[PDB]
Amino acid sequence: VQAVAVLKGDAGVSGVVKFEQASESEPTTVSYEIAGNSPNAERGFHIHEFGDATNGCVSAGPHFNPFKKTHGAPTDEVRHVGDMGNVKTDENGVAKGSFKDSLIKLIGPTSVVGRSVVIHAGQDDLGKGDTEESLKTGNAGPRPACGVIGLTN
Amino acid sequence: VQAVAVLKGDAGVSGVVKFEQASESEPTTVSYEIAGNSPNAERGFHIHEFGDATNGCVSAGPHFNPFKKTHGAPTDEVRHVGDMGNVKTDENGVAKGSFKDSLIKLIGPTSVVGRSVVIHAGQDDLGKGDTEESLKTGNAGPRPACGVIGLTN
Ligand SMILES: [Cu+]
Ligand SMILES: [Cu+]
Ligand SMILES: [Zn+2]
């Protein structure tokens, strides 16, 4: 199964995120190329619950969290399903990379097809700050771009 | 279950299409409001197979057709699942309306979540012209706007 999200917004940030998963038990490979970010930075990257673009990136809602856990890093046990951590941008502000994840799925009751990917304007603190807010969003800040995850071939 | 697609493009046409279906057996209610079209016209309106926006409305692919039938009107027995016919635009070029459909589903193996809605620049001939092309696209022409169907609440 393959899926893709095209990230768009009004702030100069844009990109493509591709997902591939062969079967339900297998990890999903996530690959991305995002440009227009601050150079040499770490930026929060997550799957949000809704694929609703009627009000910019706001209507994407909270981090996708079917299991009602707190925000964490992708390697934490306690993490939202949608937590993909920070992506690193190079000196031209481009973030490009790929990783495998075993909580994100394109198949089955937790499928992220039809939901949204959001790239943030700030660094995700990976649920390690103080605030209650660190345990909800990682204090990653505004959402300059986002896209609905759709099926492809 | 509710879903929404925001139709966008570079041609002045834009809109929102909402879908609601309570359970798998129930009809899905489709409601839309699309502006920027030719005034007093009929325009082809369909669900296309892929929710891929990497190349405008082109990468949405063909009409969603899991059962391998020919193109038809929404009331025809032989019709693609994605065939929603023509929408009528008023004197200000706005198409606004709603209908129920029993082939389009948001639940189950034929779910349209993660696929695309496309509004065409021409009238759909409802598979009644001559050509082979009438039995494939309804000769509805270019795709000025489209959007991926995403989940909402
Ligand atoms: Cu986020
Ligand atoms: Cu079409
Ligand atoms: Zn989170």
Ligand SMILES: [Zn+2]
């Ligand atoms: Zn068709």
